[PDB]
Amino acid sequence: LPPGVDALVKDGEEVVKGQELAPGVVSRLDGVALYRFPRRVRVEYVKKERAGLRLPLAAWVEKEAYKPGEILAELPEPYLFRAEEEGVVELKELEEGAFLVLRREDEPVATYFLPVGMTPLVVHGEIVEKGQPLAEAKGLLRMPRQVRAAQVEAEEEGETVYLTLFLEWTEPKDYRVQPHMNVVVPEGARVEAGDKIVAAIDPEEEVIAEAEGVVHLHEPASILVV
Amino acid sequence: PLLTLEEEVELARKVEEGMEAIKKLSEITGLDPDLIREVVRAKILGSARVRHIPGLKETLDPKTVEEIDQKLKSLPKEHKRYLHIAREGEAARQHLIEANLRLVVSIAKKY
DNA sequence: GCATCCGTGAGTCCAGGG
DNA sequence: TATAATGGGAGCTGTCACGGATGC
Structure with a gap:
């Protein structure tokens, strides 16, 4: 496999004779493909948190849970989602959507979830007072593809709803594998805190798993069809 | 075909660890x-190549290699792990020799 | 089957040898 | 015993009949 270009196929699966294995590799034979030397290991660490969002009551599509991509509300006009706490902003922009966390001193004080359609109006590290706009939702706002809403609690108050969402998603972290290192973990396996992913000559170069997650292997040095 | 650095290191590692595994299997089983x-x-080689060894105290006969393979296969999973190691x-050892046969030729053409 | 294309072993006696 | 080293060289010339082996 040329440097950097990734596989069009994954480790463990059967392939057909002539079925291309990569943008410049075609398999002369049928059988099980296998990864030789993964040069990038991406770990999807699983995060399950509780977050909140306030919405106009009319614009809300009441449901008990939300699958990804699913419409969460529809706004007839621009709407400013405002802070209900004072603090310093920690903005974590996922693939789609975001999480605001306001923190006072060294303790977190609010965790807001901005689904797709909400443009955050604050920058990481910013100071915010109660009521100031954190983000603007235009309309047809919906869940991101990468995150799902397990459970949904609602509170009516005035002309709005406050959703307490039990969200579950994954955040990826990559690691560059060196030729003198061997991946000791299979594709799609479940690591815990402290479980070793990639071994290396000297221990300070090892790859140990921070939290729980799954393992995904990318850019093999070569691919072995057997 | 000629080893890449990665295949080289992998096979060498497998050899070292298999020798350590033989040591651990000796500790467990009390054999030699x-x-x-x-x-x-x-x-690994097959019964195609199954002869006696001058240092071994017991003639290496298929019967005895089957007996020892069965004494090994009856070990608990965490011990039988070392047999697979x-x-x-051994398979890596064969492959590493075979891959480096050309270097011998390039040296020996000078003697 | 019918030619052609091959391998192979053979070539008097004596002497001396540098 | 540890930098790294990864596929070789040599030819060779004025015979002849014959049994067996390959192409037609």
Whole structure:
């Protein structure tokens, strides 16, 4: 496999004779493909948190849970989602959507979830007072593809709803594998805190798993069809 | 074909660890590390090449290699792990020699 | 089957040898 | 015993009949 270009196929699966294995590799034979030397290991660490969002009551599509991509509300006009706490902003922009966390001193004080359609109006590290706009939702706002809403609690108050969402998603972290290192973990396996992913000559170069997650292997040095 | 750095290191690692596994299997089973190495080799190579060894105290006969392979296969999973380690090591050893046969030729053409 | 294309072993006696 | 080293060289010339082996 040329440097950097990734596989069009994954480790463990059967392939057909002539079925291309990569943008410049075609398999002369049928059988099980296998990864030789993964040069990038991406770990999807699983995060399950509780977050909140306030919405106009009319614009809300009441449901008990939300699958990804699913419409969460529809706004007839621009709407400013405002802070209900004072603090310093920690903005974590996922693939789609975001999480605001306001923190006072060294303790977190609010965790807001901005689904797709909400443009955050604050920058990481910013100071915010109660009521100031954190983000603007235009309309047809919906869940991101990468995150799902397990459970949904609602509170009516005035002309709005406050959703307490039990969200579950994954955040990826990559690691560059060196030729003198061997991946000791299979594709799609479940690591815990402290479980070793990639071994290396000297221990300070090892790859140990921070939290729980799954393992995904990318850019093999070569691919072995057997 | 010629080893890449990665294939080189992988096979060498497998060899080192298989030798360590033979040592651990000797600690567990109380057998002779040489006897164990010969039985693992006998199974990796095949009965095509199954002869006696001058250092071994017991004639290496298919009967005895089967007996020792069965004494090994009856070990608990965490012990029988080392048998798979050793078999992998021997296969790597064969492959590493075979891959470096050309270097011998390039040296010997000068003598 | 019918030619052609091959391998192979053979070539008097004596002497001396540098 | 540890930098790294990865596929070789040599030819060779004025015979002849014959049994067996390959192409037609």
